[PDB]
Amino acid sequence: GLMQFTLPVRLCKEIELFHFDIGPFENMWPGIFVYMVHRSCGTSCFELEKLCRFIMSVKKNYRRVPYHNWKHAVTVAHCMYAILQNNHTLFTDLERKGLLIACLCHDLDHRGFSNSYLQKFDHPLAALYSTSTMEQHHFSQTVSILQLEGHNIFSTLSSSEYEQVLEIIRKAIIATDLALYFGNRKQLEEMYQTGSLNLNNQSHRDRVIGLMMTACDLCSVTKLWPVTKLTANDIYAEFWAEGDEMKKLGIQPIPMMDRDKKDEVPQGQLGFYNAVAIPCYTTLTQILPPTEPLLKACRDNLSQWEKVIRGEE
Numbered sequence: 588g589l590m591q592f593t594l595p596v597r598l599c600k601e602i603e604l605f606h607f608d609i610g611p612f613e614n615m616w617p618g619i620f621v622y623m624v625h626r627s628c629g630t631s632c633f634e635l636e637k638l639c640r641f642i643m644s645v646k647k648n649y650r651r652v653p654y655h656n657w658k659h660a661v662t663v664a665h666c667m668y669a670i671l672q673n674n675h676t677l678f679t680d681l682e683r684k685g686l687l688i689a690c691l692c693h694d695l696d697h698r699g700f701s702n703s704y705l706q707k708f709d710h711p712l713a714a715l716y717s718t719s720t721m722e723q724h725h726f727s728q729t730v731s732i733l734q735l736e737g738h739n740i741f742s743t744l745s746s747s748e749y750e751q752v753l754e755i756i757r758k759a760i761i762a763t764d765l766a767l768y769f770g771n772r773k774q775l776e777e778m779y780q781t782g783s784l785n786l787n788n789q790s791h792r793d794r795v796i797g798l799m800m801t802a803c804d805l806c807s808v809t810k811l812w813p814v815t816k817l818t819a820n821d822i823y824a825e826f827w828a829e830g831d832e833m834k835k836l837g838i839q840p841i842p843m844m845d846r847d848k849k850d851e852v853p854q855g856q857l858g859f860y861n862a863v864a865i866p867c868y869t870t871l872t873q874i875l876p877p878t879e880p881l882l883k884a885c886r887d888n889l890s891q892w893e894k895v896i897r898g899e900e
């Protein structure tokens with residue numbers, strides 16, 4: 588009841604910053620997530636015994652792949668924690684509750700393959716869910732774990748509060764489909780610049796939470812350079828495995844997934860920062876000013892990739 592979680596001093600202070608790295612000690616990641624729920628949401632949001640059992644089941648349903656793993660789940664939740672703590676009064680009790688869970692769950696049972704590869708392999712999930720294939724699967728796994736005995740962390744919510752929270756989580760998880768990001772950010776850009784953006788309009792909140800989700804999901808481009816650079820190795824380890832699998836089906840993968848074109852990674856990261864990351868954090872900073880550190884760190888990393896291209900590293 589009066590059982591606070593506390594972190595060592597360097598973590599207690601650094602966890603509040605956007606560029607925090609959760610570290611290589613897997614056994615501390617659950618405690619870090621509980622710490623973030625307790626300060627983000629309150630010590631009363633969830634029954635501790637249920638939350639702990641929920642976390643350990645979520646962890647067991649992430650696979651040992653190079654990037655889309657348990658460490659990515661907790662990393663994406665910590666970015667969400669930083670956004671919520673820097674924008675205290677902008678979010679409902681239900682949103683605080685839903686979004687950290689959404690982030691922890693957002694890639695449940697990922698296999699390290701894109702929606703495209705599922706469609707070309709003709710995976711059963713591609714027939715069950717024709718768009719946002721993996722993302723509809725992640726939400727489906729979340730509901731499964733929520734319905735295991737002793738795992739219902741939302742048990743104290745009313746029938747209609749429960750339905751709202753599962754709807755926040757569903758939209759949040761669907762929005763991590765980067766194919767959906769491009770149109771969502773363009774609409775948020777237009778709405779902000781014409782002054783129609785209205786946080787009382789629920790379909791507007793939906794879009795802002797969607798963009799927050801893309802920003803949390805891409806938060807590896809916002810870390811200190813050595814974290815960003817080493818994470819890129821995990822990201823490409825999956826892309827190149829998918830590339831290998833495309834070649835097995837008799838299909839030339841795109842160059843991003845072709846390990847034969849390793850040499851042009853620096854130029855590919857440039858494209859990605861300019862086409863995806865920079866716009867994402869730009870529009871997010873416009874709508875939520877205290878998120879500017881994400882944009883600043885993103886720009887610093889683009890500048891490090893430029894340096895790699897010029898042979899300065």
Ligand SMILES: Cc1c(C(F)F)nc2ccc(C#Cc3nc(-c4ccccc4)cn3C)nn12
Nearest residue numbers: 805806807808842843848851852855856858859
């Ligand atoms: C860092 C990161 C994160 C997360 F850290 F945010 N998520 C993502 C998602 C995509 C990418 C890319 C990428 C990319 N490489 C190439 C390329 C590479 C070699 C030869 C030719 C082309 C093209 N392209 C778009 N980076 N990324």
Ligand SMILES: [Mg+2]
Nearest residue numbers: 693694721763
């Ligand atoms: Mg995903």
Ligand SMILES: [Zn+2]
Nearest residue numbers: 693694763804
């Ligand atoms: Zn993700």
